[PDB]
Amino acid sequence: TMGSNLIPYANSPVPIPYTPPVTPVTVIGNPRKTTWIDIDLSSEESGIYTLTVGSYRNRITKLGPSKPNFIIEKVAAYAAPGDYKVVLNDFKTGIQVVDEGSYAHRAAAGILYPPAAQMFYGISATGTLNTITTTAKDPVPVVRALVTYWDSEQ
Amino acid sequence: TMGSNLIPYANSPVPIPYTPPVTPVTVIGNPRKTTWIDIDLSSEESGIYTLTVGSYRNRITKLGPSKPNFIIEKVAAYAAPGDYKVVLNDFKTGIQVVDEGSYAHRAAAGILYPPAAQMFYGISATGTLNTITTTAKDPVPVVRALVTYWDSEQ
Amino acid sequence: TMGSNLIPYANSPVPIPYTPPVTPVTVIGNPRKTTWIDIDLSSEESGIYTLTVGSYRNRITKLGPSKPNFIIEKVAAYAAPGDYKVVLNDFKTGIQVVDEGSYAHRAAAGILYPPAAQMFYGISATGTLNTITTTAKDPVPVVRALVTYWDSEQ
Amino acid sequence: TMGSNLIPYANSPVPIPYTPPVTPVTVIGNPRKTTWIDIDLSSEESGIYTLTVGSYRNRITKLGPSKPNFIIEKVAAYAAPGDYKVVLNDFKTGIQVVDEGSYAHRAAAGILYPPAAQMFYGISATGTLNTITTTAKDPVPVVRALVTYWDSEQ
Amino acid sequence: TMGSNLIPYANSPVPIPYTPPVTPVTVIGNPRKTTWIDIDLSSEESGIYTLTVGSYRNRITKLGPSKPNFIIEKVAAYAAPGDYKVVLNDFKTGIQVVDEGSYAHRAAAGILYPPAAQMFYGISATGTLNTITTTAKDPVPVVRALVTYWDSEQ
Amino acid sequence: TMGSNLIPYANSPVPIPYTPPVTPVTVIGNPRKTTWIDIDLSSEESGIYTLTVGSYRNRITKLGPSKPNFIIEKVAAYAAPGDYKVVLNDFKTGIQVVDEGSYAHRAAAGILYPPAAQMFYGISATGTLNTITTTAKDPVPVVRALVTYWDSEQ
Amino acid sequence: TMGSNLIPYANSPVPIPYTPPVTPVTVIGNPRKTTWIDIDLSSEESGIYTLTVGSYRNRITKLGPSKPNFIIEKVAAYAAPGDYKVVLNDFKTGIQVVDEGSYAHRAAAGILYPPAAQMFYGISATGTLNTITTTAKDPVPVVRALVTYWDSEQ
Amino acid sequence: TMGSNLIPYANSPVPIPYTPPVTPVTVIGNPRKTTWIDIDLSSEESGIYTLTVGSYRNRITKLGPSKPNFIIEKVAAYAAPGDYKVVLNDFKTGIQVVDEGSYAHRAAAGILYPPAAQMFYGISATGTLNTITTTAKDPVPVVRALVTYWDSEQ
Ligand SMILES: [Ca+2]
Ligand SMILES: [Ca+2]
Ligand SMILES: [Ca+2]
Ligand SMILES: [Ca+2]
Ligand SMILES: [Ca+2]
Ligand SMILES: [Ca+2]
Ligand SMILES: [Ca+2]
Ligand SMILES: [Ca+2]
Ligand SMILES: [Ca+2]
Ligand SMILES: [Ca+2]
Ligand SMILES: [Ca+2]
Ligand SMILES: [Ca+2]
């Protein structure tokens, strides 16, 4: 069941011997993980919430790595649930998305980065990546991002 | 293709907007990864190489986590390729495996831990888990282990 | 026919009410357009016609955007229809294409940029991209390029 | 795959030559784009929000064109999500739509312009097109409009 | 058989006339070739063998080009056949692979660069790309790399 | 997809490890390439344009090799597009081809060398291979040749 | 029937007009012909009849060409019909064939030259190609040869 | 493959013996060849270009025979590619063909001689066969003729 070659498999508190392959497995020292994350977005009175590389990086250090490398496949910004507008933006290209929402279906603006737009951000990389703009005197928006992070240290 | 709901997908250096779900995704703060690892096994003149929890832990810190939790699903010990014997052992139960090998098919002894034998080892856990015994005046053996590690810090 | 949910559709000078979706549509603030363009190529006595980023950009400002971003998917250079040669070149890689033509089938040299060769050129980007070389004392060649342009200003 | 006639297609950072058509492509100097837009609607104490041609035009200049031409295929007005009423109107014909809504399904009034009702608005055109009427002392409504805009300058 | 349009094809020491196409073929001045290469790796007492861009370039000049451009699709490092370990690494990302091997199946660590990880290296590019780490006092490892090289000079 | 044996393939800027074959690949140090070329043919007032081995060789050095070996599989000579005649000839055998053409279908004379007529020309080889004869006071003809070139230096 | 495009074909002493192709046919100035020949073989008292290149050439001048090029695909030597032996030989390789025959089935020795053994003999080529050996005081043998001859003069 | 009766056929530089037929092949001393030819047509200010038997004969001596016999199966006259007229004529019968052409499809007038109109022309035959008439002050026309020539000398 789990590669039991010698004796029958049976879930029990007692292990099971097996014959592993003739050759040790090829090992990946710094593996990768694709997973959604949540970003804090401390309140801003300007109404403009800037997503830097430091932001994603510091939020990715809370998933385990200390000095992470990452890429971004998607970014969704959700406003507060009320009658609010959120404007998501890619700082380099200029792609701009808008959505207005109600209390049930809150505002949702997403940008999607194809493999040719995906950019690798190291520990020395900085700069602004995405920018969120809500009307001033509004709650803080909700940001979700699909990243592929991995350890840098070899 | 990648969840493009608004415009057609096309791999290019320019991102693609999309409509994310009505609800943010459920996020796992400390994810898990099942992967084989390799353990150093500094030379021992007794011929006996003890695998403690500190060993697996220190080798799992090199995969990214600083204070990891882990379990073990398998352990394979491979001797040097020559005419040598390796004896693998589970210290608690007493399961003992032996193999002798030639230069092509090197010695290979594996123990397999079913879900009821899998034990969760935290950062405060210690003790001896596995013990490898080779004849004295022999090369250091090769240890492969399938672990499921994850961050502990919340 | 056009999303008429309330009353029947009928083309007439009188509009038709409808029920739009529960949620406003996700809006793309700076949309993209993939389209062929034509570049002027002022006469050169050297016989060498250099295509800079400023060239494509100034020719893309005539499609509407003032400060455009763009990528290039293809470049075809066509010589004059007579007995002439055109040499197209990518300045960075070094890819070089040649064609000789007659009065019916004029010379045609094309370079094709796959998604990994497509490069994003902003408003601060400059440099030479493509180079066309015709024999001196020849008519000006004809350049066609498939670009994906979009507004930069957010 | 992308019109590769000479060599096989392979996504890589290196372009691909190809044979373009015998004749250059027919070029459209001022292309068109059909897309939804969002209109600001500065607060009004009368409760009546007038949509002029200048409104749509100024909101369409933010999509890239400086002096745009446009037509309108649809107009949806959404009120605030609470217990509110929105009245949408075509100023010329007199078509009037009403909807009352709750916090989940917010008020939604749409007018739909068939090809015989679609009117071309230039840069010299003015006048009132649509009129929205909400009860005084109410939030500003949300307007979505499907336009087909294009550059005017030749 | 080989495009014989005038007379029948027959392999003989006498050529065969034919009617070539109406238009000369489109010519690629600097063609590309994807092929595996072998890198020398002069002995190092540190046990660490650094693969720079100069390394691949100098090994690619022996395939014919003088000033080559190239990309890398794969890198496999093979240790000596004995009881040895090889650690392959991508210097930028941090991907790390390990393998231990016997006399028959020698150690083999490979990294694979997808089209979005493939990077174009010119004649002015430098820096470290891959790093191999073997225990000190060990034989030199064996490096195989799939490159797509092409001439730069136009 | 590209030989990914360890993890799933996904085009991204992050490489993919893999298990290469048990044995390094057999490497070809001086590879071959079959491709059409174009030859300059400086104007001649005699009306006779002689194609030596030096001609093909110097035109093949512009494809990358410095000291190339080559064979010839085909030779097509195209005259100017007007009302002209071209006479192609193999200097050794005596095969002679003629064509007259109009402005649309320009003159085209081709000779085709089967594998028994294909001759290997080294860097010490010289002599006349093909001879083109156009009426004096005529434009220079266009020569296309399918060669299989390869590096000589070992 | 014979390419009659204008009027119906009818064999009669009156020609038939037709529309020839848009382009004149590609012309072969020195055509080739594969045909068997017969060689005189003036009597020799040694019993040995040497076939030089001059022999085949002089016998091929009687088929029309003055300065011919040729290759050889086969050589059959037939002895006199009585009780005689013929020995055919290739002078370069050393291939030797023997046959003895009766009055009905006369001696027949053939050598067959595959496309890699076929050699092109020009007007400057000389040397011995084939050698026939009959017992002294015997009639002259009969030689048949399949040649591919063509004019050399361009 | 090529009549190999003794040993297997294999293309190699080494010949192959075979058993030829019991009887030598029947030999044709002066073979025939049907092939198109091109005729020079020195410029004429009258605008009338007369095709004698000497013309075809002298143009057929350049295909190899010195004193040839021939017949004619077809004659196509092509004018210059511009706006010109060509009139082809059979001098004996009186058949007259006309065509006017443009720059793409040049003028083309053909006469076709069925087997009863085909006439055998020896080395003593003379006279006018075909006559071409173009307007004076025009380029020289292009004549193609399908002949069946053969050696006369026995
Ligand atoms: Ca690491
Ligand atoms: Ca269990
Ligand atoms: Ca954690
Ligand atoms: Ca890509
Ligand atoms: Ca914009
Ligand atoms: Ca315009
Ligand atoms: Ca080059
Ligand atoms: Ca051959
Ligand atoms: Ca070489
Ligand atoms: Ca000749
Ligand atoms: Ca007849
Ligand atoms: Ca004869």
TrEMBL record, chains A, B, C, D, E, F, G, H:
Binding site for Ca(2+) 1: N11
Positions contributing to Ca(2+) 2 binding: N30, D151, E153
Domain of life per record: Viruses
Entry GO CC: viral nucleocapsid
This protein's record includes keyword rRNA processing: no
Key word DNA repair present: no
Keywords: Calcium, Metal-binding, Viral nucleoprotein, Virion
Transmembrane segments: none
Protein name as annotated: Nucleocapsid protein CP17
Organism taxonomic ancestry: Viruses, Riboviria, Riboviria incertae sedis, Tombendovirales, Sarthroviridae
